[PDB]
């Protein structure tokens, strides 16, 4: 009785554990995608900032 229980629990718990890790892995994948998207948009934001700095330099030269 005890041994059969031990195997039943070990199998079903192993399946639950694998599902839990897959859920964590997919969440990490979504965070990775968002991380790359943020890398590209930070690049765009830095481009906008340097353009704004150039505009400010022109304004400073104009006066």
């Amino acid at each position: 009785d005890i041994h059969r229980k031990r195997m039943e629990k070990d199998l079903n718990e192993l399946q639950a554990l694998i599902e839990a890790h897959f859920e964590n892995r997919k969440k990490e994948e979504e965070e990775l995608v968002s991380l790359k998207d943020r890398i590209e948009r930070r690049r765009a934001e830095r481009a906008e900032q340097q353009r704004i700095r150039n505009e400010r330099e022109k304004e400073r030269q104009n006066r």
């Binding site: 890790h21 892995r25 990490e28 991380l35 890398i39 930070r42 830095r46 700095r53 400010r56 400073r60």
Partner: protein, 57 residues
């Protein structure tokens, strides 16, 4: 008025230099933060492969 104008010019020169240094520091800190995040997620992927083989046991 010339004294006031010169004072204003120095004040803004200081503020502008502060602007440029703060923007550079912000860019650098963002680079560091997201590089560190990438390293964290890479070791996460290593743990993913490690657990997959461990289940393969």
């Amino acid at each position: 008025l010339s004294d006031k104008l010169k004072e204003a010019e120095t004040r803004a020169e200081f503020a502008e230099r502060s602007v440029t240094k703060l923007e550079k520091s912000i860019d650098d800190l963002e680079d560091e933060l997201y590089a560190q995040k990438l390293k964290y997620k890479a070791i996460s992927e290593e743990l993913d492969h490690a657990l997959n083989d461990m289940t393969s046991i």
